[PDB]
Amino acid sequence: FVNQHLCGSHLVEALYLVCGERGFFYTPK
Amino acid sequence: FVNQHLCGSHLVEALYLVCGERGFFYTPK
Amino acid sequence: GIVEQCCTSICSLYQLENYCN
Amino acid sequence: GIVEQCCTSICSLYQLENYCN
């Protein structure tokens, strides 16, 4: 699921799944 | 959509929609 | 943190915006 | 940033993990 173009909610979803309990930051701009 | 219990991907989705181009951080633990 | 405020209790716009950059 | 690496180009696990806490 990670080796593709991922934009918007699709990207945030990948961060959520990969990072798990580490959490993450999403900074598009 | 924000005035409810929001967990996991549901919470991340709300952050994404509310914060927009500001981005956000998700730190569950 | 956010889980306590929004997942195990009812979330609010006010609290969500605390986690925007 | 992440959009340039993962949205307008192909993402990777390696890059995603750069944005985990």
Swiss-Prot record, chains A, B:
Superkingdom of source: Eukaryota
Protein name listed in UniProt: Insulin B chain
Section of the entire sequence shown: 25 to 53 of 110
